[PDB]
Amino acid sequence: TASFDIEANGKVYVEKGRRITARHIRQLEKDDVKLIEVPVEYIAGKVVAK
Amino acid sequence: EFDAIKIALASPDMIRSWSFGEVKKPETINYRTFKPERDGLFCARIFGPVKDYECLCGKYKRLKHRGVICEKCGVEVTQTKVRRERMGHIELASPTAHIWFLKSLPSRIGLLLDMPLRDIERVLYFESYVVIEGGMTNLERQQILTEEQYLDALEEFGDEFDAKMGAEAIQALLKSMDLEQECEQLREELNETNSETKRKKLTKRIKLLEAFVQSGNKPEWMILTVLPVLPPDLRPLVPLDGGRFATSDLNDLYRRVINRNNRLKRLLDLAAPDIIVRNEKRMLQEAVDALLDNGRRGRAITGSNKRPLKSLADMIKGKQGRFRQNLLGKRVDYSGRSVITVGPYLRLHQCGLPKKMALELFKPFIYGKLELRGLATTIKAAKKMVEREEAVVWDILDEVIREHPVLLNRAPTLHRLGIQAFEPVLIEGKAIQLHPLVCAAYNADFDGDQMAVHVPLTLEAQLEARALMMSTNNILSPANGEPIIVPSQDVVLGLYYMTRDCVNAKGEGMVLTGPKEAERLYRSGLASLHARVKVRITEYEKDANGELVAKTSLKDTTVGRAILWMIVPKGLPYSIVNQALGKKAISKMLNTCYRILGLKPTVIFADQIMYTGFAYAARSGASVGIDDMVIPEKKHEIISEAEAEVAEIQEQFQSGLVTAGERYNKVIDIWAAANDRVSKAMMDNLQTETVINRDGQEEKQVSFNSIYMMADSGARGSAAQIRQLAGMRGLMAKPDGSIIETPITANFREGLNVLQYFISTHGARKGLADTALKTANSGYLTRRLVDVAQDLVVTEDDCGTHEGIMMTPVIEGGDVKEPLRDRVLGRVTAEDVLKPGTADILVPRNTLLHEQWCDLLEENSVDAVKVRSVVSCDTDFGVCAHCYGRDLARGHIINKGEAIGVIAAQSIGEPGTQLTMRTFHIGGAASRAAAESSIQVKNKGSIKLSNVKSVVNSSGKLVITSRNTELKLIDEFGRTKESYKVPYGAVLAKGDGEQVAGGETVANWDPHTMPVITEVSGFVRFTDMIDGQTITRQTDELTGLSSLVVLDSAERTAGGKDLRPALKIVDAQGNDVLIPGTDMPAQYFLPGKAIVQLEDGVQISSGDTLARIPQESGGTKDITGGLPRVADLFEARRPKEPAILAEISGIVSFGKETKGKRRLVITPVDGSDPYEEMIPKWRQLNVFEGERVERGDVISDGPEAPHDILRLRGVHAVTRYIVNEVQDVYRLQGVKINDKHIEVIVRQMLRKATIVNAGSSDFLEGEQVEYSRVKIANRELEANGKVGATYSRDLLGITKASLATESFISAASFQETTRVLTEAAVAGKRDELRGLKENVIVGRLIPAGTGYAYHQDRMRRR
Amino acid sequence: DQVDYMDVSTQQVVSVGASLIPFLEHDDANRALMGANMQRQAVPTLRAD
RNA sequence: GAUGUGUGCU
DNA sequence: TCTGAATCTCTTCCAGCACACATCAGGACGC
DNA sequence: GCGTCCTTCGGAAGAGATTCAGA
Ligand SMILES: [Mg+2]
Ligand SMILES: [Zn+2]
Ligand SMILES: [Zn+2]
């Protein structure tokens, strides 16, 4: 489940609260995008490697 | 001689009093001329002489020097028998800890000083110091100091302060303890502190301190200072073949202990460095530990072959200890053993001994009579004459063997009938001939089993074997009123083939004047044994007061039944043989013969049935061929239909309609249905397909196929074995209890494939590995059942009360499984029973209702009899005769002074073991029913739906929304006749009040996956269900529908365990809906494996399904897998989800909201209201905020726990629940057990009773004491002006209640010998030798049967 | 068309001891285990037959 | 006397 | 921060009788 | 031929000791 508004290159791909169905992954592969925005609050559930 | 046994601690002064010398050297026999060493474990100076009346060095030789002690070696010349009576002792250089008071858990040292076990074991095994006499510093009296901390304490406080370490420190701690000051301080703390856990710990320590201060014991004796040694004769070093000796365990342990002690003493004499002597003290402590109780420490030492050797505790505790191996059972002289053969020419009071066994058995008797007649002169001459087996010895053997009964005994003696007494008949050979009429009771098949004989020596033993244990007087099993001498497997076949008719014969329509001419016809062959003639018989009747009145009639019978009537005793009605006599028919015939005539006619008639069954079975030639099992011509159509339906099930589960477990539950369903259809079709085709002409056209008769004869007569067989011989073998089960998904489709008459045989191997191994590896946990049940009921014996003629359980005939889902007659028979009623001729009594208040009374109760259609139960009796240390009933083995009231606890425990405990060594007889078949999912009522009448919460469905028909419902069908009279259990979420085509016609369907449902349903319709919002965290959601992309499965508490995320899935109902505006009756929202909780095929906010109708949960109803349901339930009930295990009850009556309402979970307060209208309860949110509440609830009503749903039901609904309700559940479990396998035994066990459950308030008694507040003591004290106080003490019955399991028995010897002999012996030594208990096992161990007349009068005389003499 | 292996003979399932029972495919395996054991425990007679 | 293995009946 | 409920950890138990065979008993090192 | 000596591996349940949480 997307904890925030999934978007890339400005346009929004998956709305907030909506699950990422396989068509979304396929379309994101087709668009060929890697860099996305994210609120800093989502970093709270992350652990540093080194 | 003595009347008590006292157990307590041993003082060093007392051990030295036991001590006769001081052993200080580990020198056994010197590997030379076999003399004991000077100061070793074996020595004549310390313990006693080796040879009888002889000195060690050889200064005295005969009795004329008895008493003097020699000079050269200092030994006494006395008996050599005293080597097993005169103990030595060891003077240890350093003290050591006795482990039984250290590691009992509860550790006595641990809770005596309130310091944990770990600190004490670290101190006693030299890892840390401990503080004694803290004094003028900050160190407490029990502080633990490590090595560095102790060094710091000495460098800063090296004053008169002391801090010891090891066993000496613990001895100082215990010696410097004041019991009275600690006791009063703990009493003050108990009075002050309000917490419950510290209260329990404090009261436990107070109990221990009270046990110390009451007896003469003292805390410092629990640390060993002197170590007594076992006498040498009880640890013998037998001289083997050669120069080596036996590797006796105790000798090696004593050698090691003496080594450590002597080395420690030598080091202490030489002033060794402190670390070395500390290590050697550790070695001494661990050596003494290994000697006392080996294996309780971390590692158990071994001497050779790396095998844990036994200490002084392994031979007192366990299966190989003295209590179970050499005290409760011993090897016995005057015994024999041989393989048994039939010899059917015998009688019930006769057995067959080999001619050579009787000469070795009755050898002293032969010696005595040879000396009496003067044929011999001395004992050795008679011995030589017997060994030479002279002709005179054979003549005189027939004299001693005449009327001296012996004890025939089998190896597994499951029940009371395992030992029966027969007179011997001397025959040649080497085999023990056995009368086949008792082989069913013995369970002694003739396939190579060994029985054991025993010779009653004394006069009383012979008379007991003649009057009590004789097989003639043992024709009624103690389990039930059915006879135990049932003909079987040849006699049943012979009688059934004789007492049968077919329409043709050599002579058919002829007339005879009696049985004699029928015999003349059959012997001459002028009329077949299956004719249909009209003989003239003279049957007798005893309508008068014991006088037989004659009558003569002309009845239409066969030749065979006429012949059989010749042996029927004068007095039975002829309408007992005028049918096809199977096994149950002749069992009922023998039963009614016993009930009407008596014992001698019954035994004579049983022998005559034996003879006339064997003769006409030999003459019958009822063989078996390969042309007798006929294959039905429609079984393959049934397997084709079942294959089509399971192929439909394939598409059903692969699509997603049902899951893997549901598919497995439905496939077994359809295979079992097909198996049941094939069995019935084959049975019909094999029992009716025969053609015969009556001198005209063809007529149908009951078939004469041999297999049908031996499957209908019931001689040996059932539906299962023959069903597998022809048609469908069925589906078999794995050893774990699961059933194979594929049943093999073939029969043994046609053959098996190379793969179907591999599949049937699963069931074949299941049966055997189930017998041999799960009869252990069924013999354990009967062991710990005989243990818990050994001390219960009838002691009084009548307790004279009015209390008694309420007795009803049970109908639990089918027809009348057991009626009133089979249930109340042979039990004394508790009050004047009211017939439906009300305001008038039918049966008096204290009449033992026999068969005539049972018939009278059946005639007037009585459905509610108040009967006296053995659990409600009022006697002390036993039960009165009237609260039990009949002997169940004789046709009269039970005799006062009979051990019924043992016959109850054995009767309960050996259908399980017997039938669990029988599941391989049918092969390996699952034998699982078809799990019917519909209600086909048969009888005509109305419906009384009790405790039903039904709702309206979208179709309009009633749907049940309650779990404790039952649909009872009652006929037009109003008496109860039928009762079916409808399940949750079932639709009803009818209701209550309407007279339902006989032969319709009223209820339908789905067997697997019982559904949760709703009361009010509306839209459902998916609350607390996010995909992945708590629910697995799968969705098809094309259609877009969610069919999710929820997770358990197992596979769910750890963080998300606080998230609980549920479906909340909302309206079009999303507002809160309400349950009809209250204002609380419709929060329908979802359990695990709940599948939902809906969408959020969909429009539904009221009373529809919402989710499905699989049931996983899988199992063979045999007595092997299916009886842990009896163990759970008897040991009283708390169920996993106990249904909370209403502990007090009054109005019901909530108090605080969400004190973690839900809360509820019950308040009465008159009394105080301090009761609150904690309600986890798992279970919905069947009550609301505005009703009145009574004591015992279920707040929630689930299985009842056999503690709260007792504490709330009383003794009668819990005993009836236990009786009903155990009876259903046993009747599921066809066993017939009388309920009296179960009530005896339940009464043995209730012996402990915690005190509510002290009152005027001397008992403490929370102390748990015997209920008999409480009753006696209350009855004594009520005779005075005081007031009795209020109590409450507790319910501990059979193991728990047996381990806490007042006589410590029983508990010590049963289980946990260390934990019981330590408790008895600490408490200083005093056994009274009151029960049966105590007198068995001591070796007296048990106060059970014939010795009960002697025990009464011995008790009343003091 | 899908198979690629076939059993050598029917006798390969059972041991050497249990293979000596004739008509084994009609006996139940429960009475085949004991039959194999009591064939294992036989004693040689005087004139072998 | 104790361990180890095999076996019979339940 | 005290005190019940839940969990961790230690101990007990596991059918009865019988028969046959074997080994084994300190075995390592010095004399 | 004499003779004296210093491995793990069950599993069902009960109880007694810890930890948790929770108000
Ligand atoms: Mg048998
Ligand atoms: Zn002497
Ligand atoms: Zn009574």
The nucleotide whose C1' lies nearest the CA of B414 is E16
- Asked if residue B105 keeps its beta carbon closer than 7 A to nucleic acid strand E, the reply is yes
DSSP per-residue string spanning B98-135: -GGGTSSSS-HHHHHTT--HHHHHHHHTTSSEE-B---
Q: How far is residue B318's CA from residue B478's CA, in Å, rounded to a whole number?
A: 31
Cα–Cα distances in angstroms (integers) from residue B12 to residues B95, B223, B228, B261, B594, in the given order? 11, 10, 9, 17, 67
Q: How far is residue B739's CA from residue B761's CA, in Å, rounded to a whole number?
A: 13
- Asked if residue B238 keeps its beta carbon closer than 7 A to nucleic acid strand D, the reply is yes
CA of B335 to C1' of E17 (A): 13
CA of B1134 to C1' of E13 (A): 20
Q: How far is residue B822's CA from residue B818's CA, in Å, rounded to a whole number?
A: 6
β-strands B806-807, B794-796 pairing: unpaired
Contacts of B1205 by beta carbon, 8 Å cutoff, 6+ apart: B1141, B1192, B1213, B1214, B1217
Could you tell me the two tokens for B868? 């006296």
- B883 closest CA partner among B868, B901, B898, B900: B868
In a 3-state reduction of DSSP, which class is residue B437?
helix
Handedness of CA B823, B828, B830, B834 (dihedral sign): positive
CA of B409 to C1' of E20 (A): 23
Tell me if A22 and B1027 make a contact (CB, 8 A cut-off): no
Q: Which residue has the tokens 């008493």?
A: B67
The answer to whether the CB of B690 falls within 8 A of the CB of B630 is no
Q: After which residues is chain A broken (C to N over 2.5 A)?
A: none
Q: Which residue has the tokens 């084709």?
A: B640
Phi, psi torsion values for B256, nearest 5 degrees:
-65, -45
| Alpha helices per DSSP H over B598-737 | 600-618, 635-655, 660-688, 706-712, 719-725
- Asked if residue B1049 keeps its beta carbon closer than 7 A to nucleic acid strand E, the reply is no
Contacts of B1066 by beta carbon, 8 Å cutoff, 6+ apart: B1018, B1019, B1020, B1021, B1072, B1073, B1097
Q: Helices B1235-1245 and B1204-1227 sit at what angle, rounded to 10 degrees?
A: 150
Could you tell me the two tokens for A40? 């800093």
Contacts of B1103 by beta carbon, 8 Å cutoff, 6+ apart: B951, B952, B953, B954, B959, B1013, B1014, B1015, B1017
Q: How far is residue B371's CA from residue B365's CA, in Å, rounded to a whole number?
A: 10
Could you tell me the two tokens for B938? 């048969």
CA of B46 to the centre of ligand 2 (A): 13
- B111 closest CA partner among B120, B98, B122: B120
Phi/psi class of residue B488: alpha, beta or left (left: φ > 0; alpha: ψ in -120 to 50)? beta
Residues 1070-1089/B with CB within 7 Å of nucleic chain E are none
Determine the longest span between alpha carbons in chain B, in angstroms: 126
Number of neighbouring beta carbons within 10 Å of residue B1281: 7
Q: How far is residue B1313's CA from residue B1306's CA, in Å, rounded to a whole number?
A: 10
CA of B2 to C1' of F11 (A): 45
Set of chain B residues whose Cβ sits within 8 Å of the Cβ of C27: 748
- Is B3 marked as binding a ligand? no
Contacts of B1111 by beta carbon, 8 Å cutoff, 6+ apart: B665, B1008, B1009, B1010
Is residue B340 exposed (0-12), middle (13-18) or buried (19+ Cβ within 10 Å)?
A: buried
Considering only CB atoms, C13 lies closest to which of B724, B754, B764, namely B754
Long-range (24+ apart) CB contacts under 8 A made by C24-27 are: C24/B757, C25/B751, C25/B752, C25/B753, C25/B754, C25/B757, C26/B748, C26/B749, C26/B751, C26/B752, C27/B748
Interface test with chain C among B740, B754, B766, B771, by most C beta carbons within 10 Å = B754
> How many degrees, rounded to 5, is the angle at CA B90 between CA B89 and CA B94?
145
DSSP per-residue string spanning B708-752: HHHHHS-SS--HHHHHHHSS--B-BB-TTSPBPSS-B---TTT--
Q: How far is residue B714's CA from residue B492's CA, in Å, rounded to a whole number?
A: 7
Determine the longest span between alpha carbons in chain A, in angstroms: 35
Residues 754-773/B with CB within 7 Å of nucleic chain E are 771-773
Q: After which residues is chain C broken (C to N over 2.5 A)?
A: none
Contacts of B517 by beta carbon, 8 Å cutoff, 6+ apart: B535
3-state secondary structure B294-362: CCCCCCCCECCCCCECCCCCCCCCCCCCHHHHHHCCCCCCCEEEEEEECCCCCCCCEEEEEHHHHHHHC
β-strands B335-341, B432-433 pairing: parallel
The nucleotide whose C1' lies nearest the CA of B304 is E26
Tell me if B764 and C28 make a contact (CB, 8 A cut-off): yes
CA distance A8 to chain B (A): 24
What burial letters (b/e) apply to B1048-1082, b meaning 16+ CB within 10 Å? eeeebeeeeeeebbebbbbeeeeeebeeeeeeeeb
Number of neighbouring beta carbons within 10 Å of residue B1083: 15
Q: Is C11 touching B (CB cutoff 8 A)?
A: no
Q: How far is residue B822's CA from residue B839's CA, in Å, rounded to a whole number?
A: 27
- Asked if residue B307 keeps its beta carbon closer than 7 A to nucleic acid strand D, the reply is yes
- Do C and B touch, 3+ Cβ pairs within 8 Å? The answer is yes
Q: Is B762 touching C (CB cutoff 8 A)?
A: no
- B338 closest CA partner among B425, B449, B415, B412: B449
Contacts of B41 by beta carbon, 8 Å cutoff, 6+ apart: B23, B26, B27, B28, B229, B232, B235, B251, B254, B255, B258
DSSP per-residue string spanning B867-903: B--GGG---SSSEESTTT-B-SSSSSBPPSS--HHHH
Set of chain B residues whose Cβ sits within 8 Å of the Cβ of C10: 754
Among all residues of chain A, which has the CA nearest to that of B1040? Answer: A21
DSSP conformational letter for B1208: H
Tell me if B757 and C33 make a contact (CB, 8 A cut-off): no
Whether the ω angle into residue B273 lies within 30 degrees of 0, i.e. cis, is no
Residue B612 corresponds to which amino acid? T
**What are the beta bridge partners of residue B338?**
B451
CA of B142 to C1' of F8 (A): 38
Contacts of B1153 by beta carbon, 8 Å cutoff, 6+ apart: B1159
Could you tell me the two tokens for B256? 């090691």
Set of chain C residues whose Cβ sits within 8 Å of the Cβ of B762: none
DSSP per-residue string spanning B1054-1100: SGGGG---EEEEE-TT--B---TTSSS--EEE--TT-EE---TT---
The answer to whether the CB of B774 falls within 8 A of the CB of B1119 is no
CA distance B1025 to chain A (A): 12
Number of neighbouring beta carbons within 10 Å of residue B456: 19
What burial letters (b/e) apply to B1138-1162, b meaning 16+ CB within 10 Å? ebbbbebbbebeeeeeeeeebebbb
- B1015 closest CA partner among B1083, B947, B963: B1083
In a 3-state reduction of DSSP, which class is residue B381?
helix
Residue B805 corresponds to which amino acid? I
In a 3-state reduction of DSSP, which class is residue B829?
strand
Give the count of alpha carbons within 13 A of B131, CB side only. 22
Could you tell me the two tokens for B1097? 């906010």
DSSP per-residue string spanning B438-457: GHHHHT--TTT-EEEEE---
Is residue B109 exposed (0-12), middle (13-18) or buried (19+ Cβ within 10 Å)?
A: buried
Q: How far is residue B439's CA from residue B716's CA, in Å, rounded to a whole number?
A: 14
DSSP per-residue string spanning B853-870: HHHHHHHTT---EEB--G
- B1024 closest CA partner among B1070, B1082, B1083: B1083
Q: Could you tell me which chains touch chain B, where touching means 3 or more CB pairs under 8 A? A: A, C
Q: How far is residue B818's CA from residue B815's CA, in Å, rounded to a whole number?
A: 9
The nucleotide whose C1' lies nearest the CA of B255 is F6
Q: Is C33 touching B (CB cutoff 8 A)?
A: yes
Phi, psi torsion values for C22, nearest 5 degrees:
-75, 150
Set of chain B residues whose Cβ sits within 8 Å of the Cβ of A26: none
Q: How far is residue B910's CA from residue B783's CA, in Å, rounded to a whole number?
A: 10
Q: Which residue has the tokens 């050698």?
A: B255
Method: cryo-EM
Set of chain B residues whose Cβ sits within 8 Å of the Cβ of A21: 1037
Contacts of B1329 by beta carbon, 8 Å cutoff, 6+ apart: B3, B4, B5, B1303, B1305, B1335, B1338, B1340
Q: Helices B363-373 and B379-387 sit at what angle, rounded to 10 degrees?
A: 120
Determine the longest span between alpha carbons in chain C, in angstroms: 56
Q: How far is residue B413's CA from residue B396's CA, in Å, rounded to a whole number?
A: 34
What burial letters (b/e) apply to B840-850, b meaning 16+ CB within 10 Å? eebbeeeebbe
The answer to whether the CB of B1336 falls within 8 A of the CB of B1342 is yes
Considering only CB atoms, B1027 lies closest to which of A19, A22, A23, namely A19
Q: E strand or H helix at A12, and its extent?
A: strand A11-14
Contacts of B65 by beta carbon, 8 Å cutoff, 6+ apart: B55, B77
Q: How far is residue B1269's CA from residue B1259's CA, in Å, rounded to a whole number?
A: 10
Q: How far is residue B591's CA from residue B850's CA, in Å, rounded to a whole number?
A: 14
DSSP conformational letter for B631: P
Residues 450-479/B with CB within 7 Å of nucleic chain E are 450
Could you tell me the two tokens for C49? 């037959």
Q: How far is residue B45's CA from residue B25's CA, in Å, rounded to a whole number?
A: 14
Tell me if B1027 and A23 make a contact (CB, 8 A cut-off): no
> How many degrees, rounded to 5, is the angle at CA B1186 between CA B1183 and CA B1187?
60
The answer to whether the CB of B498 falls within 8 A of the CB of B560 is yes
In a 3-state reduction of DSSP, which class is residue B1349?
helix
Our measurement of the distance from residue B740's CA atom to the centroid of its chain's CA atoms, rounded to an integer in Å, reads 30
CA of B308 to C1' of D3 (A): 11
Q: Helices B196-214 and B1313-1323 sit at what angle, rounded to 10 degrees?
A: 60
Q: How far is residue B1067's CA from residue B1065's CA, in Å, rounded to a whole number?
A: 7
Could you tell me the two tokens for B28? 């056994």
The answer to whether the CB of B232 falls within 8 A of the CB of B47 is yes
Q: How far is residue B107's CA from residue B934's CA, in Å, rounded to a whole number?
A: 59
Could you tell me the two tokens for B105? 């858990």
Q: How far is residue B79's CA from residue B86's CA, in Å, rounded to a whole number?
A: 12
- B223 closest CA partner among B292, B303, B130: B292
Phi, psi torsion values for B507, nearest 5 degrees:
-140, 125
Residue B389 corresponds to which amino acid? E
β-strands B794-796, B879-880 pairing: parallel
The answer to whether the CB of B1142 falls within 8 A of the CB of B1162 is yes
Cα–Cα distances in angstroms (integers) from residue B47 to residues B29, B33, B38, B88, in the given order? 14, 19, 12, 7
Handedness of CA B342, B343, B349, B355 (dihedral sign): negative
Architecture label for domain B634-770: Orthogonal Bundle (1.10)
Q: How far is residue B587's CA from residue B594's CA, in Å, rounded to a whole number?
A: 11
- Is B445 marked as binding a ligand? yes
- B530 closest CA partner among B494, B511, B506, B565: B506
Q: Is C21 touching B (CB cutoff 8 A)?
A: no
Tell me if B1037 and A22 make a contact (CB, 8 A cut-off): yes
The radius of gyration of chain A's CA atoms, rounded to the nearest angstrom, is: 12
Cα–Cα distances in angstroms (integers) from residue B1141 to residues B46, B962, B1192, B1288, B1289, in the given order? 68, 16, 6, 17, 18
- Is B449 marked as binding a ligand? yes
- B170 closest CA partner among B208, B105, B224: B224
Could you tell me the two tokens for B92? 């240890």
Q: How far is residue B9's CA from residue B1322's CA, in Å, rounded to a whole number?
A: 7
Tell me if B748 and C27 make a contact (CB, 8 A cut-off): yes
Covered bases, chain E (protein CB within 7 Å): 2-5, 10-19, 24-27
Phi, psi torsion values for B76, nearest 5 degrees:
-95, 150
Could you tell me the two tokens for B743? 């049943």
Could you tell me the two tokens for B5? 């046994």
Q: Helices B776-788 and B900-909 sit at what angle, rounded to 10 degrees?
A: 160
Q: How far is residue B1121's CA from residue B490's CA, in Å, rounded to a whole number?
A: 32
Tell me if B768 and C32 make a contact (CB, 8 A cut-off): no
- B101 closest CA partner among B165, B55, B167: B167
Tell me if A23 and B1026 make a contact (CB, 8 A cut-off): no
% helix, strand, coil for chain B, step of 5 = 35, 15, 50
> How many degrees, rounded to 5, is the angle at CA B1195 between CA B1192 and CA B1197?
105
Q: E strand or H helix at B579, and its extent?
A: none
Tell me if C26 and B758 make a contact (CB, 8 A cut-off): no
- B438 closest CA partner among B474, B464, B482: B474
Q: Which residue has the tokens 């459902």?
A: B1020
Q: How far is residue B674's CA from residue B641's CA, in Å, rounded to a whole number?
A: 8
β-strands B432-433, B450-454 pairing: unpaired
CA of B268 to C1' of E31 (A): 34
**What are the beta bridge partners of residue B424?**
B351
Q: Could you tell me which chains touch chain C, where touching means 3 or more CB pairs under 8 A? A: B
